[PDB]
Design a protein around this nucleic acid. Sequence first.
RNA 1: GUUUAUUAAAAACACAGCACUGUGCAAACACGAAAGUGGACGUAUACGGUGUGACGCCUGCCCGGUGCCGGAAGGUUAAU
RNA 2: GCUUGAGUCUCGUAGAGGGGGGUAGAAUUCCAGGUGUAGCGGUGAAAUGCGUAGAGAUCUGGAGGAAUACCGGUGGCGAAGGCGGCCCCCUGGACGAAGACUGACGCUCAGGUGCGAAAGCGUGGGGAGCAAACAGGAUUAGAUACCCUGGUAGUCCACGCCGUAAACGAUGUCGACUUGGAGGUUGUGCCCUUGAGGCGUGGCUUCCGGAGCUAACGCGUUAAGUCGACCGCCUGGGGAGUA
Lengths: 100, 117, 271, 55, 51, 88
Amino acid sequence: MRHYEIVFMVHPDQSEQVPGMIERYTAAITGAEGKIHRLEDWGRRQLAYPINKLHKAHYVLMNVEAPQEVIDELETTFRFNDAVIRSMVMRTKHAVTEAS
Amino acid sequence: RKQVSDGVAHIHASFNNTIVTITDRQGNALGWATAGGSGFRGSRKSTPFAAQVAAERCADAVKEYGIKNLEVMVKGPGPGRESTIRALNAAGFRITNITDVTPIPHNGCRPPKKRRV
Amino acid sequence: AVVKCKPTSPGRRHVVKVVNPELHKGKPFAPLLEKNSKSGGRNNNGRITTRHIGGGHKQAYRIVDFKRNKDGIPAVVERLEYDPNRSANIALVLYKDGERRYILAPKGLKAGDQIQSGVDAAIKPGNTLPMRNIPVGSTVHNVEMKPGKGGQLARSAGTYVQIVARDGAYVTLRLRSGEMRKVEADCRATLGEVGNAEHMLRVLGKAGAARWRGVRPTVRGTAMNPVDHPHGGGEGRNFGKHPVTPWGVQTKGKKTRSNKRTDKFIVRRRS
Amino acid sequence: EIDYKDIATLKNYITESGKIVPSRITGTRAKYQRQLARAIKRARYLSLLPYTDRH
Amino acid sequence: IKVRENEPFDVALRRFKRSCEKAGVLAEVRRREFYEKPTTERKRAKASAVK
Amino acid sequence: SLSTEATAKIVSEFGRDANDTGSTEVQVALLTAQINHLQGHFAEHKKDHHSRRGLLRMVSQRRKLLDYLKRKDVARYTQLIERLGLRR
RNA sequence: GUUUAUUAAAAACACAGCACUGUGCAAACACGAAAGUGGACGUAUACGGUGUGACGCCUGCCCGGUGCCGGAAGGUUAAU
RNA sequence: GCUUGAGUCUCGUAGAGGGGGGUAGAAUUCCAGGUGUAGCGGUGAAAUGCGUAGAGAUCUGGAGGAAUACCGGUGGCGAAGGCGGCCCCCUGGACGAAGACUGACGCUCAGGUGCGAAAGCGUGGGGAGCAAACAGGAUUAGAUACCCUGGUAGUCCACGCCGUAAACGAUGUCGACUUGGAGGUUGUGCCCUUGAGGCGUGGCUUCCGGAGCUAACGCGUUAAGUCGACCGCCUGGGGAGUA
């Protein structure tokens, strides 16, 4: 399985649904037999420039080893679900320092 | 007869001409003046002294409003902004900050080729 | 794809065929067939009301689902078929409870694909949903004008509708003409664009192909007489007045739209 | 060596307008300057750093 | 780009108004940086300058 | 690029002695496997001329290696082409 | 291919192509005093009107006049 | 037979190498709206043009297209053309310590085949800026131009052509030998694990320069120096890369 790193921002309005989608995404990876190397929730965080005319946003990082099929399904899920304003899934620079 | 006393000067300066516009903090413009309304044509309005006259006339137009403190936002490559802040400070507003909002794009759109001479 | 014919004869010199090997070779589904008799150029008063319509090939009407229903029942797509009644191809689909229906076939649809129609349906080409479960920016087709009526927009081959905005109860749509119009958000729409996008690439090659389509010859008013057309007459070729319809209304320019109850729905006129 | 997730180092390596300062001013190596520019662009995309100070 | 006046001040001016890169790059983004000729001429001039 | 496990499998299959990664049959079989994988790649990606140049380099290398093996030992050449399935 | 069935079969008409323009569906348009009907059980890759007439190379300049499209500041202007 | 030419495998490294898709941020233009008044724009000067039906200026919201400021470099990659936001998928090449393997499998290559800037051509889209043609206004003795105001093809995408450039390093490819210095970029061994400190070994590159060569300018270990293999081309200028 291939390593990846996913950072996504959630609405402050839908900031109460963040542990639910964390459970959903970890359930999807563990059902596709991948693992989560890291998972960090930075909470509500001030953003440098406003996007969607919106206030400070909820930040989640995860390092995830998973097949590229379920990573593509995760990225299309991030596309179709409008609760996430922005997502970045990146393969490169894997095996980062833990909790940085 | 305005009580909020906060204004913004917008100085659109360019190699032909400058335009000074005093507005409120929300973007609704209160007054404006320019080198052409000040009485200069061509090179005489591209001179920075015409910008000083334009800013003095714009400050005269806003003296009815009575703005105490005035932000400054300059825009463009014109020679007249450097006299426009001096003319507004000689008029008597308190300049809290000076900002440069000239459009420095990325590559973006293709520039013209005109005036090769 | 497109097939340029060899010029073994004039009439085969200039014809391009579009052929789909994926289309079904054989009879259509007989429970979804109805009788279609030719009636163009024939009012109930018996007069020709639309000109240049006459005899073509005999055709049978296929009952195609436009108001798509059976919400929550997935349907597997069998072989795509040919439809004479429209430029698009159609797909015979089989629901899980044993019901076969005809669907306007989208661009990526193959035999064996799963489609669904409900409000819980996953957004995917071939699936239909009301436009409040469909994201803004997606290209749709077979979209209703009223909730429950059936698809009236983007039914031709290769056509699509862009979902541009949302009012909150209405959805702004960019149509294939370039027009922006407001359609209620409870109106359903099938995702993706309509297949057979190579339909506009066919060239008929000869007059006989238009006659098989059913298009009678078009006579020019300049070729007619002054009694027949407003154009017409002269001892040469030039008439020399402003171009009009056969009934006198000017035909180059002269927008003719007299609706006033839908002007609240059309937002930007087509260009 | 260079990661885009922290912000203090990356604000030390940008200027006030959000631009990347040149390697001839910073003194950093070329490989680390390229990695720095890539991390700055990724942080700008995730809005941890601004593209410009005007908006 | 941005300055803010310190609350003791006798006059409002900009201390880097002649060394600012904004008018330097605006006159270049107005028209046609060649990116192959002037950088070559400038680097050749720098190589002739430093020795 | 051909995977390490795939190259190890082809080396073990086409090497009658252990650690024979340089023999002509092993090289030709590696090139043939990469050629089939790149045909699967280029069918989806036409107009990849820069990768097709490397494909043609691998084809020319495989052809020159097969010419050398045919000159050296015709039985090895016939056995290799009849277990690989090419040059009809 | 069609045409003045009964003095003209043609270079005429049509034609596949090309373009302009109208048309968002209870479409435009047509027949109808109206219901209704065709268009069409079609839906802008669709339908109508106009002109040109496979194909190859092309289609230049003029918006003053007459049409058409857009705008409403001013003048003139009906019933009331 | 051999490995020393050529190639393969193990583990890594850098890179705008290529193809597909998605997304982000400045900015330009357009539409709708708020404030506000008599100019804006342009030039050596003006004028055509926009604005008295409200322009320009400022602010808000929306639409669409194209290119990716800084990093950015006498940097990097690719056979050449060429390739610059970020992320993913597929993929080509290059280089390095160390070890193993095959064993001349190599070099060049007329015909042949493929790639091949920009402009152009065909079909279908798209079209924000820019802009051949075109129009107006200037300039001039004239101005079918340089300048300004607009502005169509085109520039953008998909699939096909076209096959040319000052396609240049005006230097064909491969191999070997030959004094040196100063940098850049990219791997690695040792030293004091204490530092972007010292000593070596590789690749790719930029500049100066010794012998030598050249008509000279200059080239000079990446040669235009000393040779070897093979291919392409020239035989005075114009006519003419024309019939």
